[PDB]
Scaffold this active site. Sequence first.
Site, PDB file in Angstrom:
ATOM      1  N   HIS A   1      82.607 -27.742 116.236  1.00 24.34           N
ATOM      2  CA  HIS A   1      83.617 -26.685 116.190  1.00 24.34           C
ATOM      3  C   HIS A   1      84.562 -26.729 117.384  1.00 24.34           C
ATOM      4  O   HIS A   1      85.760 -26.480 117.227  1.00 24.34           O
ATOM      5  CB  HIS A   1      82.958 -25.314 116.083  1.00 24.34           C
ATOM      6  CG  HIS A   1      82.416 -25.034 114.721  1.00 24.34           C
ATOM      7  ND1 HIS A   1      83.224 -24.971 113.603  1.00 24.34           N
ATOM      8  CD2 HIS A   1      81.149 -24.854 114.282  1.00 24.34           C
ATOM      9  CE1 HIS A   1      82.477 -24.731 112.541  1.00 24.34           C
ATOM     10  NE2 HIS A   1      81.213 -24.655 112.924  1.00 24.34           N
TER      11      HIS A   1
ATOM     12  N   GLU B   1      82.112 -31.127 127.656  1.00 29.47           N
ATOM     13  CA  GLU B   1      80.847 -31.320 126.942  1.00 29.47           C
ATOM     14  C   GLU B   1      79.789 -31.884 127.877  1.00 29.47           C
ATOM     15  O   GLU B   1      80.021 -32.898 128.544  1.00 29.47           O
ATOM     16  CB  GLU B   1      81.009 -32.256 125.742  1.00 29.47           C
ATOM     17  CG  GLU B   1      79.687 -32.745 125.166  1.00 29.47           C
ATOM     18  CD  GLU B   1      78.796 -31.607 124.685  1.00 29.47           C
ATOM     19  OE1 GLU B   1      79.326 -30.681 124.027  1.00 29.47           O
ATOM     20  OE2 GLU B   1      77.572 -31.637 124.979  1.00 29.47           O
TER      21      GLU B   1
ATOM     22  N   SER C   1      75.518 -31.674 106.056  1.00 30.20           N
ATOM     23  CA  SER C   1      76.210 -31.584 104.775  1.00 30.20           C
ATOM     24  C   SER C   1      77.524 -30.828 104.925  1.00 30.20           C
ATOM     25  O   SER C   1      77.558 -29.743 105.517  1.00 30.20           O
ATOM     26  CB  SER C   1      75.330 -30.901 103.735  1.00 30.20           C
ATOM     27  OG  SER C   1      75.605 -31.416 102.447  1.00 30.20           O
TER      28      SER C   1
ATOM     29  N   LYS D   1      78.837 -37.604  99.312  1.00 33.39           N
ATOM     30  CA  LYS D   1      78.204 -36.425  98.729  1.00 33.39           C
ATOM     31  C   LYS D   1      78.954 -36.044  97.457  1.00 33.39           C
ATOM     32  O   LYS D   1      80.173 -35.816  97.487  1.00 33.39           O
ATOM     33  CB  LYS D   1      78.192 -35.255  99.717  1.00 33.39           C
ATOM     34  CG  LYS D   1      77.624 -33.963  99.143  1.00 33.39           C
ATOM     35  CD  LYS D   1      77.696 -32.839 100.177  1.00 33.39           C
ATOM     36  CE  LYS D   1      77.398 -31.476  99.555  1.00 33.39           C
ATOM     37  NZ  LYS D   1      77.240 -30.431 100.614  1.00 33.39           N
TER      38      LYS D   1
ATOM     39  N   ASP E   1      79.166 -21.570 116.004  1.00 29.50           N
ATOM     40  CA  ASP E   1      77.850 -20.942 116.128  1.00 29.50           C
ATOM     41  C   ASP E   1      77.834 -19.879 117.215  1.00 29.50           C
ATOM     42  O   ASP E   1      76.995 -18.967 117.180  1.00 29.50           O
ATOM     43  CB  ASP E   1      76.769 -21.985 116.438  1.00 29.50           C
ATOM     44  CG  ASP E   1      76.088 -22.532 115.196  1.00 29.50           C
ATOM     45  OD1 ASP E   1      76.659 -22.403 114.085  1.00 29.50           O
ATOM     46  OD2 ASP E   1      74.977 -23.115 115.347  1.00 29.50           O
TER      47      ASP E   1
ATOM     48  N   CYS F   1      72.805 -52.617  97.774  1.00 28.93           N
ATOM     49  CA  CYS F   1      72.332 -51.924  98.963  1.00 28.93           C
ATOM     50  C   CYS F   1      71.814 -50.516  98.696  1.00 28.93           C
ATOM     51  O   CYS F   1      71.183 -49.934  99.585  1.00 28.93           O
ATOM     52  CB  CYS F   1      73.454 -51.853 100.011  1.00 28.93           C
ATOM     53  SG  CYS F   1      74.745 -50.639  99.623  1.00 28.93           S
TER      54      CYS F   1
HETATM   55  C1  LIG Z   1      67.954 -26.448 110.345  1.00 30.17           C
HETATM   56  C2  LIG Z   1      69.458 -26.335 110.263  1.00 30.17           C
HETATM   57  C3  LIG Z   1      70.145 -27.015 109.266  1.00 30.17           C
HETATM   58  C4  LIG Z   1      71.537 -26.925 109.156  1.00 30.17           C
HETATM   59  N1  LIG Z   1      72.180 -27.615 108.133  1.00 30.17           N
HETATM   60  C5  LIG Z   1      73.487 -27.512 108.050  1.00 30.17           C
HETATM   61  C6  LIG Z   1      74.173 -28.237 106.992  1.00 30.17           C
HETATM   62  O1  LIG Z   1      73.655 -28.950 106.136  1.00 30.17           O
HETATM   63  N2  LIG Z   1      75.534 -28.061 106.993  1.00 30.17           N
HETATM   64  C7  LIG Z   1      76.260 -27.299 107.889  1.00 30.17           C
HETATM   65  O2  LIG Z   1      77.486 -27.231 107.744  1.00 30.17           O
HETATM   66  N3  LIG Z   1      75.616 -26.627 108.885  1.00 30.17           N
HETATM   67  C8  LIG Z   1      74.299 -26.745 108.958  1.00 30.17           C
HETATM   68  N4  LIG Z   1      73.643 -26.064 109.950  1.00 30.17           N
HETATM   69  C9  LIG Z   1      74.445 -25.331 110.930  1.00 30.17           C
HETATM   70  C10 LIG Z   1      75.032 -26.272 111.985  1.00 30.17           C
HETATM   71  O3  LIG Z   1      73.996 -27.025 112.617  1.00 30.17           O
HETATM   72  C11 LIG Z   1      75.839 -25.476 113.015  1.00 30.17           C
HETATM   73  O4  LIG Z   1      76.638 -24.523 112.324  1.00 30.17           O
HETATM   74  C12 LIG Z   1      76.781 -26.324 113.877  1.00 30.17           C
HETATM   75  O5  LIG Z   1      76.157 -27.547 114.277  1.00 30.17           O
HETATM   76  C13 LIG Z   1      77.281 -25.575 115.093  1.00 30.17           C
HETATM   77  O6  LIG Z   1      78.399 -26.285 115.670  1.00 30.17           O
HETATM   78  P1  LIG Z   1      79.008 -25.842 117.049  1.00 30.17           P
HETATM   79  O7  LIG Z   1      80.089 -26.844 117.477  1.00 30.17           O
HETATM   80  O8  LIG Z   1      79.409 -24.398 116.882  1.00 30.17           O
HETATM   81  O9  LIG Z   1      77.798 -25.939 118.078  1.00 30.17           O
HETATM   82  P2  LIG Z   1      76.919 -27.187 118.527  1.00 30.17           P
HETATM   83  O10 LIG Z   1      77.100 -28.302 117.570  1.00 30.17           O
HETATM   84  O11 LIG Z   1      75.522 -26.634 118.783  1.00 30.17           O
HETATM   85  O12 LIG Z   1      77.602 -27.636 119.858  1.00 30.17           O
HETATM   86  C14 LIG Z   1      77.561 -26.817 121.046  1.00 30.17           C
HETATM   87  C15 LIG Z   1      77.847 -27.756 122.190  1.00 30.17           C
HETATM   88  O13 LIG Z   1      77.980 -27.029 123.431  1.00 30.17           O
HETATM   89  C16 LIG Z   1      77.545 -27.890 124.455  1.00 30.17           C
HETATM   90  N5  LIG Z   1      77.319 -27.104 125.660  1.00 30.17           N
HETATM   91  C17 LIG Z   1      76.388 -26.114 125.842  1.00 30.17           C
HETATM   92  N6  LIG Z   1      76.430 -25.550 127.025  1.00 30.17           N
HETATM   93  C18 LIG Z   1      77.460 -26.220 127.669  1.00 30.17           C
HETATM   94  C19 LIG Z   1      78.020 -26.089 128.955  1.00 30.17           C
HETATM   95  N7  LIG Z   1      77.590 -25.210 129.864  1.00 30.17           N
HETATM   96  N8  LIG Z   1      79.049 -26.904 129.279  1.00 30.17           N
HETATM   97  C20 LIG Z   1      79.484 -27.783 128.371  1.00 30.17           C
HETATM   98  N9  LIG Z   1      79.040 -27.995 127.131  1.00 30.17           N
HETATM   99  C21 LIG Z   1      78.020 -27.177 126.838  1.00 30.17           C
HETATM  100  C22 LIG Z   1      76.316 -28.577 123.874  1.00 30.17           C
HETATM  101  O14 LIG Z   1      76.021 -29.749 124.628  1.00 30.17           O
HETATM  102  C23 LIG Z   1      76.793 -28.847 122.435  1.00 30.17           C
HETATM  103  O15 LIG Z   1      77.394 -30.126 122.252  1.00 30.17           O
HETATM  104  C24 LIG Z   1      72.241 -26.148 110.085  1.00 30.17           C
HETATM  105  C25 LIG Z   1      71.560 -25.484 111.097  1.00 30.17           C
HETATM  106  C26 LIG Z   1      70.175 -25.562 111.193  1.00 30.17           C
HETATM  107  C27 LIG Z   1      69.464 -24.824 112.296  1.00 30.17           C
HETATM  108 CL   LIG Z   2      75.844 -27.854 100.717  1.00 29.75          CL
HETATM  109 ZN   LIG Z   3      76.435 -51.926  98.505  1.00 34.26          ZN
END
Ligand SMILES: Cc1cc2nc3c(=O)[nH]c(=O)nc-3n(C[C@H](O)[C@H](O)[C@H](O)COP(=O)(O)OP(=O)(O)OC[C@H]3O[C@@H](n4cnc5c(N)ncnc54)[C@H](O)[C@@H]3O)c2cc1C
Ligand SMILES: [Cl-]
Ligand SMILES: [Zn+2]
Length: 664
Positions: free
Chosen positions: A46, A68, A80, A106, A397, A598
């Site tokens: 995000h 990051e 997904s 997908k 998130d 494959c």
């Molecule tokens: C079991 C499970 C399954 C899921 N399956 C799906 C799915 O199939 N499809 C889907 O769309 N969503 C899915 N989700 C939700 C998805 O994982 C999250 O919505 C998404 O990854 C969040 O993205 P983000 O960029 O908001 O946060 P994140 O991807 O968590 O990134 C936050 C970042 O902040 C960084 N950070 C933290 N503190 C600091 C700091 N002080 N300084 C600098 N950087 C820092 C971290 O290193 C990290 O890279 C799933 C979630 C779970 C728990």
């Molecule tokens: Cl889905």
């Molecule tokens: Zn192939």
Amino acid sequence: PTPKYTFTERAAAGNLSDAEILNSNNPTGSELPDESDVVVGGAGIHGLIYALHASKYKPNNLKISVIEKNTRPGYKIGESTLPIFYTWCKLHGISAAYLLRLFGLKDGLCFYFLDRENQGQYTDFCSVGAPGLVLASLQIERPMSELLFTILAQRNGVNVYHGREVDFKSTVVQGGGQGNKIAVSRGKYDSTPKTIDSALFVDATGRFRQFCSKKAPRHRFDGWNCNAFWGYFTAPKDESKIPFDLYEGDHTNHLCFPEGWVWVIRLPSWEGSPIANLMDMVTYILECADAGVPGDELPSSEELARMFGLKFQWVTSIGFAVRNDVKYPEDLSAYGTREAEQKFNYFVQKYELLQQFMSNFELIENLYGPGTTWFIRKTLAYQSPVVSGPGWLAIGDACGFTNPLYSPGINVGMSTSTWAAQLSHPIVEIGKSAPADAAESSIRKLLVPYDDYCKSLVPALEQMNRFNYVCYRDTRLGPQVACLWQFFAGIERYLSDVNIETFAHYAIKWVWGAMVPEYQQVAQKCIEHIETVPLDERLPDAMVDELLAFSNRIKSAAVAADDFSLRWDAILRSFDRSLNFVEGKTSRDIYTRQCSGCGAWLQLRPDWKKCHSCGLLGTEPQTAVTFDPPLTAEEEALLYAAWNTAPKYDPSKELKLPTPTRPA
Ligand SMILES: Cc1cc2nc3c(=O)[nH]c(=O)nc-3n(C[C@H](O)[C@H](O)[C@H](O)COP(=O)(O)OP(=O)(O)OC[C@H]3O[C@@H](n4cnc5c(N)ncnc54)[C@H](O)[C@@H]3O)c2cc1C
Ligand SMILES: [Cl-]
Ligand SMILES: [Zn+2]
Ligand SMILES: CC1(C)c2[nH]c3ccc(Cl)cc3c2C[C@@]23CN4CCC[C@]4(C[C@@H]12)C(=O)N3
Ligand SMILES: CC1(C)c2[nH]c3ccc(Cl)cc3c2C[C@@]23CN4CCC[C@]4(C[C@@H]12)C(=O)N3
């Protein structure tokens, strides 16, 4: 384009660490700038969607730096993605031929509902995606998607700094033009932190809520929450021994039962690849995208791995997402030594169909480094009560999360990321153009709708999650009520009209259809009834009858009122064109095939004769889409014509909404 090896050679020549080779691709340089308009904490998906959409929405207006703490794009669960996400990628200049080189195909969502008291019995709910000449959905390895978006960001005037951490103890966030002093270090141990003077801070630190947790405690919803435990497995070429009829690996598959559900996602993994080599491969894919290289003339995934010295393999992501009011046996030492492993293996042997299913898969040890054979996360759903304030806002998130089911995390969450991106331009300009008090008041008033949307977004998603969970307690309610209503309310009507300008406005009106009144009405009826039945009991058959009859009465009128034309019987295998359940129906459109060489799943279109993953020329150069019911040559040309062209926006025409037409 001839492939270049710029980063591989730069890394070797200077003996550069992972973070240093990544940061060397920044437009303003490898060191942090003294000042910026926007500082983004976190380069998860995000944070990068935000920075990309902000720059693309209005180029050369904001200086944006993303911080990051991972040294290279790190592992994330959440693989997904949905049509809205692909459309955003296409609007940012990367279409399916290029994305399929990096990510898994997908084609829709499929559900299998397992009867608990009648082991072996199951029903299903099948849906397809779209023809190859319309669009694709993607299963993404998150280290690769965040690398992709890092490189693309760096190529569009955004600086991204890996291996750097925002120090939220010494960071100062205020209103008043350039009020922020963001302290950035290499970690706790670092004695020499840098400061970026800036106007706007974006909290994209995900569930860690590193900034907004300072402004409000984490909020939890009433009732049960969920736990997840998961791992990574092989991906068989031969899927025919899977115990579910008509199973296909290129869906996001859902194995559903009273306690929860299991996700099954087939995707390629690039783990083991050096970061510099990956940068060269991504840069090459982007240059091919810019040049419009046809898919058949683009190297296949495996060919890219040989060209750039990469590791490539097919894996299956498989995980449980179950309620946290499940009773576990006190001693689970028979199923492993770690809690995640123990509860995974324990749940598998509770359902004969799960055990027969999992017997097709081989566990992969430590795919993402040591300790990563098994993962567990407890108490998934939460919300941030405060998502903006003087000098800052939160996205993704960091605003809240519910559940993996229907993938709202990325695909709905990007509504916040992209809206915040669009809003950042006036926010920064206000601060440069008015005295401090009036700037703060004007910015606050501008963000009232953003705050109000976030506030009501996560509760709506939580109700959507509970709706599906309770209906998964029965093999009729799951497919005929919950899945039917999610796809009727939530299909992305008029997606082909969206562009960069209207994307955020469209996205915030979608919400997977969770705001649709008739959807909420059925959801509340089912939740109210089913939550009174203890989890360890079967739903009374009379309760299922009543809920099904209620759902169908509400459905017929809401469907009649929809003015959007859609071949429902071609998209939902079990339903006719008016969304009536048909007991024996198997007819559906066919948009994909499996490579015989494959095993990779491919989209059917006449200009893609070669497998995009391994390069094997098509088993026969004439497998075309099957439309059932048929489409004429003119109707098929018309469908494709609507999706190849993206429209420049007229400031006058009103946005057509994704949700069903009101009855009014
Ligand atoms: C079991 C499970 C399954 C899921 N399956 C799906 C799915 O199939 N499809 C889907 O769309 N969503 C899915 N989700 C939700 C998805 O994982 C999250 O919505 C998404 O990854 C969040 O993205 P983000 O960029 O908001 O946060 P994140 O991807 O968590 O990134 C936050 C970042 O902040 C960084 N950070 C933290 N503190 C600091 C700091 N002080 N300084 C600098 N950087 C820092 C971290 O290193 C990290 O890279 C799933 C979630 C779970 C728990
Ligand atoms: Cl889905
Ligand atoms: Zn192939
Ligand atoms: C809208 C679309 C992105 C979509 N969004 C879904 C959500 C849930 C489910 Cl179950 C299916 C879909 C689909 C399949 C669709 C239906 N449309 C028919 C004409 C063009 C299009 C686009 C695409 C098509 O070919 N397939
Ligand atoms: C509907 C509107 C109030 C709106 N509500 C939003 C919510 C979120 C986001 Cl990101 C954007 C908007 C917009 C922009 C709009 C789109 N409409 C086109 C014709 C008239 C109008 C009104 C206005 C216009 O000129 N701009």
